[PDB]
Design a protein around this ligand. Structure first.
Ligand SMILES: CCCCCCCCCCCCCCCCCC(=O)OC[C@H](COP(=O)([O-])OCC(O)COP(=O)([O-])OC[C@@H](COC(=O)CCCCCCCCCCCCCCCCC)OC(=O)CCCCCCCCCCCCCCCCC)OC(=O)CCCCCCCCCCCCCCCCC
Ligand SMILES: CCCCCCCCCCCCCCCCCC(=O)OC[C@H](COP(=O)([O-])OCC[N+](C)(C)C)OC(=O)CCCCCCCCCCCCCCCCC
Ligand SMILES: CCCCCCCCCCCCCCCCCC(=O)OC[C@H](COP(=O)(O)OCCN)OC(=O)CCCCCCCCCCCCCCCCC
Ligand SMILES: CCCCCCCCCCCCCCCCCC(=O)OC[C@H](COP(=O)(O)OCCN)OC(=O)CCCCCCCCCCCCCCCCC
Ligand SMILES: CCCCCCCCCCCCCCCCCC(=O)OC[C@H](COP(=O)(O)OCCN)OC(=O)CCCCCCCCCCCCCCCCC
Ligand SMILES: CCCCCCCCCCCCCCCCCC(=O)OC[C@H](COP(=O)(O)OCCN)OC(=O)CCCCCCCCCCCCCCCCC
Ligand SMILES: CCCCCCCCCCCCCCCCCC(=O)OC[C@H](COP(=O)(O)OCCN)OC(=O)CCCCCCCCCCCCCCCCC
Ligand SMILES: CCCCCCCCCCCCCCCCCC(=O)OC[C@H](COP(=O)(O)OCCN)OC(=O)CCCCCCCCCCCCCCCCC
Ligand SMILES: Nc1nc2c(ncn2[C@H]2C[C@H](O)[C@@H](COP(=O)(O)OP(=O)(O)OP(=O)(O)O)O2)c(=O)[nH]1
Ligand SMILES: [Mg+2]
Lengths: 345, 99, 48, 53, 58, 459, 320, 54, 98
């Protein structure tokens, strides 16, 4: 791609969620959703391989179906209430279809079957763009209508999201699929805390984003697609294993890392609203998430997997690849827990 | 077979340093680490700290409670009071329920 | 001349050094001035 | 050159002095009941202004 | 004596994309590391005593 | 408490800025000074509790644990000096940093006035033990052992977190003294029973209770010497301190919810003493002895007699010291012979007379020789258990008999008998490890001389 | 200023800096047949940068101080040991082959970067497109195994199509007895211990497989020794050579820019050569890798990034 | 007890259960047809829960 | 109007169910997607004309334009699938499972 279409595509990718967040109209949040989808599709099919085409096709058909369901809900609300916003008395069926389609857009379970496959087959920076940027707009639409949604449907969607995400991330080996089921579990946490306190939903979203960014940067340092590929990182870049361990433990929610704070304050608010059984099941599935994180840590940092012979030449070569804001996001995603009252509102 | 360094054998450290003290290979750091452990372990901790603990006074007021016990026994025995009352709290200043 | 290729960081980027040092100095001076102004504003508002 | 060689030996004593200072700051912060406990409510001596610092 | 480190066996149990080869998933292969002429044979003719086997790319 | 926390915090820049030929010396000397500074918490000339700040406090129960941790840290460095002599400087400084992080976070854990801060520091201490065991462990089972330890402890600790947040929402502050003063009785309902189990099982896993004790032997075997020390001497007692802190707000239904755990503890210390009799690994045998001693601590804490709480306190300190000494002697033998087999090294009394003497005093402290704090703990636990029920004396007697048997079996098969003359790679002794045994054994003698320091909260 | 998208926007166009002599020319031949001299003369009288055969120490000579490092840092494979005993059980042959392919890949990346940055043509000796010849020769001689062949083919499939084929491939056809006579006359005692079966395998791999896949996508210039041994007719053919086939015609400015980024980042170049395929020939254990990597780190000038090593005279470290 | 039955009871049983569940739940054939059929089932189920919750 | 709006919603529901139940033709899937698009256009237009909402009659024009660009993107993707596989069969799109 030449810089003209690079700038246009990145500007529309930026602009979609910005229109969705800045917009007070259901129609404009919709059109921002397909700015995001349409602008990001050439970026998935940038590599021009059958796997990228497969991911782009599945992603397109999923988002198209969900966007048509969203527009159905918008049109039905427009007939029922004469306005372009779910104000207070729109139909619960309409609100549930809206929640259905936004959960389909997000890729949380049981609508999660496309997210690991779409995350696979695309480059790592597009996995980062998807799993971080493409979720703010559906979260924005969900946050705008928090008192109207159905707590039962949200709680079911959330608990099965964490269940399927924990089990998948336990299952596979591929880094992109691991990050995708990690995203599914984290979106389950955000969705569960959505109807009671959207501020904690935003806090969990920012914590997940600042944890997902240095994962993907560290993967892009060596294009480590595999558990083995990140396992020989000690020969390639040994000065990163400590932060890999700290940020993966933060993703697991282990104190005193700052990734414990979203799960902790979410459990605290859920128990303020008396859903103890739900909170316990969520925390146990978070322990499963921490299990596959700990296996990944064992593979990459605490043990030293055998290496190759060309790694000598790769160490002979130099590198200027790792960017400056990797360390800033890494430190903010590891050592921010004593600033918890400042992080929460 | 994958390339791998052979299994090392531990050497007799006393063969090259007969005055080995367990801390470091060369003699100077070994003897200075030995002196640092001996001086900071036994000399100014196991003795100075022991003296400080031994001369902590009235530790959880055993001595004060002994003196107060002797004073109270003397008081209640020269005035004929019971040594211990059966009730800690005065029954007049407790309002029991009617049933 | 040690390395066979000319290093990128063989010489310090003087523009980057000057911009970073001046930026840090400017934020420090602005921080002190804003802290003093906030102290004075708080005392004036609360009558202290 | 002795201060350059053995500058690492002041960090732990500096931390000890800083910890004593922070204990003193906490002690003067928690003075809401100084000379106000009913066990130790006593009239102030003319040569002193506080019971403890 | 020396600390144990993973060998080829412990390194090779982490490839296969599954961690758990069952009867319904053991046929799967791990993804590749890099994630990776039909032309017109027209017969020009009776527009007519000319035959043209004409090979076209669009 | 800040005057102990801050210089221990500043130990880390000293570690990372010291010369590679001076790092061990500087950190060991300054950590000895940390222990000397931490000895000032014993200045308790009043019945009142040392409340240093709104966040930290010292207690007659919390103080011996803090002093014990600050004392073990230089001993930890001494034991870790030998097996890292062929190791990189950066990894050596990292290991020293991990131990210092253990020491700092455990002082904050014992000195915290808030149970939620206590929980945060609880698995904040869990993380570096995992890292130490997983990275510096020797055998191939260290990864499995770390998984077992971490997930027993976390599946324990999650219902503790839910119970803590529920208690905070119900009461309002979760401050320890506020809870102790405005303690409210429970209605003995099913919700309160499940809440009691939720706030009990985390510390029961960390103890470990019998049946759920399986993480301890493999973690202690595949752990390094510093990991074995930190586990067997601090972390089990940390679970002990957790139960003692949390049991105050659990009246009255602990008087019948104590029933299965007391039986589990008594039968489990008998079971693990039998395993100690028929155990072929020295580290495993010491680990199961630790399980039996902490089972005694469970029995005392659950019967909730003041004499039992005192016996639990003195057994905490005494068992921590003697278990650290036992693991040190086992690790010295392991660094000699490069093996962990119980029966392989037999006649070490001949070659190592002073080390066999240290072995003998360590085992005598293990088997409760009078007038040591070990036997004071077991005897007062015995008295309180017999007061609770007169038929507990049978299980106590069987446990004490098998305890003497496994301690003397240790001594006979590791020191006495004919020498295995094929072990020509037997270096005589390191002054470092002899100093390590002396620094383990002298505080046992001093605390035997003055047992009033470790009596605890009750008396 | 480091090359990038900003430099491409401000103007660093490869097609703007191209000229007639901006060509990739590769000289190929058997073990000892006039390959070095002809490439040097062609580059000298065409004004082109000559890249000799990438040996074991190519990365050592192109990185750091440029002195050859120790063998354990540079591949741990000896051509002399391979000539003395090619069927050794330690896997010296396939280690040497993979290391030489990695060296050739680094040399091709360097030559492509030089051509895309300066516009000067390059004359390489035996680039990556003719190293599978040595691979198949050792496989047919039984020196390596089918797993090694599959791993080499996988690495070649991973790395090869990302770059551009050479504009011209000049080949030196030479008989095996002539190669044997030249090898005997050279006088390297390890090099006389080579088999005519191996040399015939090299020549057959050339004729049957290498020349056609060059032939449908670039210009092939097979010459004899007597057609060679005079570097004027070959240069005349290069002058009167027309490049009307291959993917070089379809390249534009932004494709050149992305290829320039790919060849200017050496980690992406050698990314797929270190795939975690655990052949015992090339797998190195954790302890040996730790010792080798550590000793390479206290090698002088290699502890930090270049320009940050105070032991070799780098200044203003605190200021940058 | 220790080397057989407590291992069979708590940890290996938990690991076997979670291994069976993760294999059963991520034995996905990778077909968008099956995925969209699953999505249709999810839609029908959520309509059913809305109708029974009201 | 309520009967015809009910018919339009059932048409959208049928098109959605057809989209969710795949057949061998991704072209047929895209045609079902535009069945949903067309049903949305008629419901929006009839609602605007019934409510006399002249401010919101641009909304059908915007849904038509946006959905048409989205389907152009989808047609380009189907062209890519047909080029790489010969056909547009959705069962050829399944190698991202592992
Ligand atoms: C001190 C602690 C914090 C250090 C942070 C920096 C870390 C770092 O860069 O370390 C490298 C550097 C040492 O490197 P080096 O030896 O010089 O050379 C580099 C090697 O050549 C590099 O060689 P290499 O890269 O080729 O190979 C090494 C590589 C090889 O890789 C490995 O070996 C992999 C290891 C895997 C296992 C470990 C995984 C990670 C575990 C982390 C800990 C987790 C548990 C702890 C508790 C939970 C924490 C959340 O990495 C390592 O060995 C590990 C590198 C990092 C080590 C330091 C880690 C520090 C953080 C953890 C401890 C402290 C925080 C927790 C405890 C807090 C207290 C309770 O560290 C330092 O220099 C430390 C700082 C010392 C100076 C402090 C000065 C303070 C001045 C204050 C005044 C001025 C500021 C005022 C501000 C306010 C103004 C108002
Ligand atoms: C390491 C041990 C693992 C196994 C045991 C785990 C703990 C068992 C006992 C506690 C129940 C489960 C944790 C709940 C934590 C909160 C408890 C609480 O607040 O109780 C009061 C509350 C009740 O709150 P309440 O007191 O407000 O009650 C309402 C009362 N009125 C109406 C009058 C105001 O109890 C619960 O909410 C408990 C519900 C738990 C449901 C979910 C359980 C999931 C499975 C847990 C174990 C999973 C791991 C092990 C699996 C097997 C491994 C081999
Ligand atoms: C409030 C929400 C704010 C937005 C949160 C989500 C941000 C997601 C990331 C967007 C940008 C990603 C991107 O452009 O990735 C490609 C790029 C590749 O890195 P590289 O080519 O080295 O370029 C860096 C040059 N120094 O990678 C990058 O440049 C990585 C940039 C990551 C920025 C993360 C910001 C998090 C929020 C603060
Ligand atoms: C608290 C938690 C601890 C956790 C582990 C900590 C490990 C690190 C320890 C660091 C140091 C801490 C030491 C703690 C124990 C201190 C022991 C001690 O001195 O106790 C005081 C005790 C005095 O007794 P007292 O306190 O009055 O109580 C009994 C009456 N109720 O003293 C005594 O009874 C005697 C003191 C020791 C024995 C004497 C040693 C010197 C002997 C010199 C003899 C010289 C020759 C003879 C000279 C002439 C004699 C007439
Ligand atoms: C919560 C956290 C809030 C703050 C987050 C951002 C922190 C500062 C980030 C900027 C920074 O550190 O810039 C330093 C950088 C140094 O420049 P240098 O490394 O010399 O790169 C030149 C290479 N040719 O300097 C520059 O990049 C240019 C100078 C600063 C421009 C602003
Ligand atoms: C391992 C061995 C487990 C079995 C041990 C032997 C049986 C113990 C029975 C027991 O604990 O009984 C106590 C109590 C008796 O019932 P009660 O006092 O009437 O309580 C009223 C509750 N509504 O019983 C109850 O209150 C019923 C619930 C008891 C739960 C105890 C712990 C169960 C195991 C947790 C692990
Ligand atoms: C007397 C008291 C009785 C009551 C208390 C009982 C509970 C005590 C505490 C629980 C302890 C559980 C310990 C779990 C870890 C031990 C098992 C283990 O290590 O499994 C390893 C195995 C993976 O092994 P792997 O490394 O892949 O290969 C072997 C070598 N390479 O792993 C696997 O195959 C899968 C492992 C999955 C992760 C296990 C840890 C998290 C478990 C979460 C449980 C959630 C329960 C609630 C669920 C919701 C309700 C149904
Ligand atoms: C409602 C949900 C169930 C609908 C079942 C429709 C029939 C069916 O099972 O069709 C399966 C078919 C699968 O696609 P195909 O490519 O044909 O696969 C070959 C078959 N192995 O699927 C298709 O070909 C797609 C069919 C789409 C049909 C859309 C219109 C449906 C109208 C009827 C609705 C259901 C009526 C049920 C009546 C029951 C009796 C009263
Ligand atoms: N096994 C093996 N040997 C190689 C490879 N590349 C080069 N060699 C050997 C062949 C020669 O003995 C030696 C030097 O390479 P040359 O082909 O340049 O030989 P030389 O310089 O003697 O002759 P020349 O005049 O340049 O053709 O390296 C390779 O990929 N594999
Ligand atoms: Mg040559």
């Amino acid at each position: 791609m030449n810089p003209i279409t690079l700038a246009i595509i990145y500007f529309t990718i930026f602009l979609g969620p910005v229109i969705t967040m800045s917009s007070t109209n259901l129609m404009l949040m919709w059109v921002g959703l397909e700015f995001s989808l349409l602008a990001i599709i050439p970026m998935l099919i940038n590599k021009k391989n059958p796997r990228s085409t497969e991911a782009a096709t599945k992603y397109f058909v999923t988002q198209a179906t969900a966007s048509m369901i969203i527009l159905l809900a918008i049109v039905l609300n427009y007939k029922q209430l004469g306005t372009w916003m779910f104000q207070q008395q729109t139909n619960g069926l309409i609100l549930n279809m809206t929640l259905m389609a936004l959960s389909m857009k997000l890729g949380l379970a049981p609508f999660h079957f496309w997210l690991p496959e779409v995350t696979q087959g695309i480059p790592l920076h597009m996995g980062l763009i998807l799993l971080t940027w493409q979720k703010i707009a559906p979260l924005s639409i969900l946050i705008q209508i928090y008192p109207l949604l159905n707590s039962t449907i949200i709680l079911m969607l959330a608990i099965t999201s964490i269940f399927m995400g924990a089990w998948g991330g336990l299952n596979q080996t591929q880094m992109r699929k691991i990050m995708a089921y990690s995203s599914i579990a984290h979106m389950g946490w955000m969705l569960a805390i959505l109807p009671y306190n959207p501020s904690l939903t935003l806090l969990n979203l920012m914590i997940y984003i600042i944890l997902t960014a240095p994962m993907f940067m560290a993967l892009m340092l060596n294009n480590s697609m595999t558990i083995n590929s990140i396992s020989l990182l000690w020969n390639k870049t040994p000065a990163m294993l400590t932060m890999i361990s700290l940020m993966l433990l933060s993703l697991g929610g282990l104190p005193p890392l700052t990734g414990f704070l979203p799960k902790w304050i979410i459990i605290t608010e859920l128990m303020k609203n008396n859903c103890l059984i739900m909170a316990t099941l969520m925390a146990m599935m978070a322990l499963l998430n921490l299990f596959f994180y700990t296996r990944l840590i064992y593979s990459t940092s605490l043990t030293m997997f055998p290496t190759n012979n060309n790694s000598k030449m790769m160490t002979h070569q130099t590198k200027t690849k790792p960017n400056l804001m990797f360390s800033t996001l890494a430190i903010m995603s590891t050592m921010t827990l004593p600033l918890a009252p400042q992080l929460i509102t | 077979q994958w390339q791998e360094d052979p299994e090392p054998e531990d050497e007799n450290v006393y063969a090259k340093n007969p005055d080995f003290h367990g801390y470091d290979s060369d003699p100077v750091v070994d003897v200075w680490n030995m002196r640092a452990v001996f001086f900071f372990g036994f000399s100014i901790v196991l003795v100075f700290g022991t003296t400080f603990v031994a001369y902590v006074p009235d530790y959880r007021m055993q001595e004060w409670a002994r003196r107060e016990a002797e004073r109270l026994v003397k008081y209640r025995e020269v005035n004929g009071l019971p040594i211990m009352e059966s009730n800690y709290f005065d029954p007049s200043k407790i309002q029991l329920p009617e049933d | 001349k040690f390395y066979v290729r000319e290093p990128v960081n063989a010489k310090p980027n003087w523009l980057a050094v000057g911009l970073s040092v001046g930026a840090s100095v400017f934020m420090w001076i602005y921080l002190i001035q804003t802290h003093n102004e906030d102290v004075l504003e708080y005392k004036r508002r609360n009558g202290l | 050159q002795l201060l350059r060689e053995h500058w690492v030996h002041i960090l732990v004593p500096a931390g000890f002095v800083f910890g004593c200072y922070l204990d003193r700051k906490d002690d003067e912060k928690l003075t809401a009941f100084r000379n106000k406990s009913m066990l130790f409510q006593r009239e102030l001596r003319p040569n002193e202004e506080v019971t403890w610092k | 004596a020396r600390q144990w480190q993973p060998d080829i066996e412990w390194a090779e149990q982490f490839s296969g994309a599954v961690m758990y080869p069952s009867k319904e998933t053991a046929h799967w292969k791990p993804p590749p590391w890099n994630d990776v002429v039909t032309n017109m044979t027209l017969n020009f003719g009776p527009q007519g005593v000319l035959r043209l086997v004409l090979e076209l790319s669009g | 408490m800040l005057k102990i926390i801050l210089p221990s915090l500043m130990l880390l820049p000293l570690t990372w800025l010291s010369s590679p030929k001076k790092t061990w010396t500087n950190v060991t000397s300054y950590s000895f000074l940390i222990s000397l500074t931490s000895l000032t918490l014993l200045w308790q000339t009043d019945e009142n509790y040392k409340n240093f700040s709104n966040m930290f406090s010292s207690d007659p129960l919390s103080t011996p644990l803090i002093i014990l941790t600050a004392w073990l840290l230089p001993l930890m460095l001494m034991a870790s000096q030998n097996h890292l002599k062929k190791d990189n400087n950066v990894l050596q400084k990292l290991y020293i940093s991990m131990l210092i992080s253990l020491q700092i976070l455990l002082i904050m854990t014992f000195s915290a006035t808030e149970l939620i801060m206590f929980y945060i520091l609880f698995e904040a201490t869990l993380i570096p033990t995992l890292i130490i065991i997983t990275r510096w462990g020797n055998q191939t089972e260290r990864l499995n052992a770390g998984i077992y330890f971490l997930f027993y402890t976390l599946i324990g600790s999650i219902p503790l977190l839910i119970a803590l947040i529920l208690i905070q929402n119900h009461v309002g502050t979760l401050n320890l003294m506020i809870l102790s003063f405005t303690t409210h009785t429970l209605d003995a309902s099913w919700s309160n029973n499940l809440l009691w189990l939720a706030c009990m099982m985390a510390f029961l896993i960390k103890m470990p209770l019998y049946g759920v004790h399986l993480w301890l032997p493999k973690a202690h075997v595949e752990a390094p010497i510093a990991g074995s020390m930190i586990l067997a001497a601090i972390l089990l007692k940390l679970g002990s301190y957790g139960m003692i802190r949390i049991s105050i707000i659990l009246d009255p239904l602990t008087k019948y919810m104590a029933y299965p755990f007391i039986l589990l503890s008594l039968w489990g210390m008998i079971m693990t003493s039998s395993i100690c009799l028929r155990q072929t690994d020295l580290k495993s045998l010491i680990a199961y002895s630790s399980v039996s001693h902490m089972a005694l601590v469970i029995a005392s804490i659950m019967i909730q007699t003041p004499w039992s709480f005192m016996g639990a306190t003195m057994l905490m300190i005494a068992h921590g010291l003697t278990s650290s000494l036992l693991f040190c002697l086992a690790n010295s033998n392991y660094e000699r012979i490069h093996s962990r087999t119980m029966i392989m090294a037999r006649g070490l009394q001949m070659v190592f007379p002073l080390m066999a003497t240290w072995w003998l005093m360590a085992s005598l402290a293990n088997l409760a020789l009078p007038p040591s704090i070990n036997l004071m703990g077991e005897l007062f636990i015995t008295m309180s258990l017999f007061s609770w029920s007169n038929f507990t004396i049978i299980l106590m007697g069987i446990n004490i008999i098998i305890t003497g048997m496994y301690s003397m079996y240790m001594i006979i098969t590791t020191q006495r008998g004919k020498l295995t003359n094929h072990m020509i790679n037997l270096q005589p002794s390191h002054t470092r490890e002899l100093t390590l045994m002396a620094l383990h054994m002298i505080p046992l003698i001093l605390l035997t001389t003055s047992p009033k320091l470790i009596t605890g909260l009750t008396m | 200023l480091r090359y990038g998208l900003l430099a491409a926007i401000l103007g660093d166009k490869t097609t703007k800096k191209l000229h007639e002599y901006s060509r990739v020319i590769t000289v190929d031949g058997n073990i000892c047949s006039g390959k070095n001299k002809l490439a040097k003369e062609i580059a000298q009288q065409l004004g082109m940068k000559h890249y000799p055969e990438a040996g074991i120490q190519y990365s050592s000579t192109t990185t750091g101080d440029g002195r050859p490092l120790d063998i354990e840092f540079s591949g741990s494979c000896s051509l002399e040991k391979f000539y003395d005993d090619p069927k050794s059980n330690d896997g010296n042959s396939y280690r040497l082959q993979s290391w030489l392919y990695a060296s050739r890949l680094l040399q091709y990346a360097d030559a492509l970067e030089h051509l895309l940055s300066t516009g000067q043509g390059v004359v390489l000796e035996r680039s990556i497109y003719s190293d599978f010849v040595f691979l198949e020769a050792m496989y047919n001689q039984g020196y390596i195994r089918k797993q090694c062949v599959d791993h080499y083919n996988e690495i070649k499939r991973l790395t090869l199509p990302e770059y551009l084929p050479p504009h011209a491939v000049i080949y030196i056809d030479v008989p095996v007895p002539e190669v044997q006579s030249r090898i005997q006359k050279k006088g390297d005692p390890h090099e006389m211990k080579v088999t005519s079966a191996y040399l015939q395998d090299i020549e057959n791999a050339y004729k049957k497989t290498f020349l056609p896949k060059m032939s449908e996508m670039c210009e092939v210039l097979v010459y004899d020794s007597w057609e060679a041994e005079d570097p004027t007719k070959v240069v005349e053919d290069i002058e009167y050579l027309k490049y009307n086939k291959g993917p070089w015609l379809k390249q534009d400015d932004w494709t050149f820019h992305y290829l320039r980024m790919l060849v200017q980042d050496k980690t992406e170049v050698l990314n797929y050569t270190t795939i975690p395929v655990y052949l015992p020939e090339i797998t190195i254990g954790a302890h040996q890798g730790s010792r080798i990597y550590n000793s390479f780190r206290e090698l002088p000038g290699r502890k930090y990034a270049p320009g940050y090593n105070a032991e070799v005279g780098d200044k203003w470290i605190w200021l940058k | 007890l220790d080397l057989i039955w407590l291992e069979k009871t708590i940890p290996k049983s938990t690991s076997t259960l979670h291994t069976n569940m993760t294999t059963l739940t991520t034995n996905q054939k990778g077909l968008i047809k099956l995925y969209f059929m699953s999505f249709l089932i999810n839609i029908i189920l959520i309509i059913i829960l809305y109708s029974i919750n009201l | 109007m309520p009967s015809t709006f009910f018919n339009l919603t059932m048409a959208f529901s049928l098109s959605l169910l057809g989209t969710l139940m795949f057949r061998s033709h991704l072209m047929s899937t895209l045609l079902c997607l535009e069945g949903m698009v067309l049903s949305l256009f008629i419901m929006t237009s009839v609602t605007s004309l019934n409510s006399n909402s002249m401010s919101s009659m641009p909304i059908p024009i915007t849904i038509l334009v946006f959905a048409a660009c989205e389907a152009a993107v989808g047609l380009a993707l189907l062209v890519k699938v047909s080029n790489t596989y010969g056909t547009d069969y959705v069962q050829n799109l399944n190698l991202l499972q592992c």
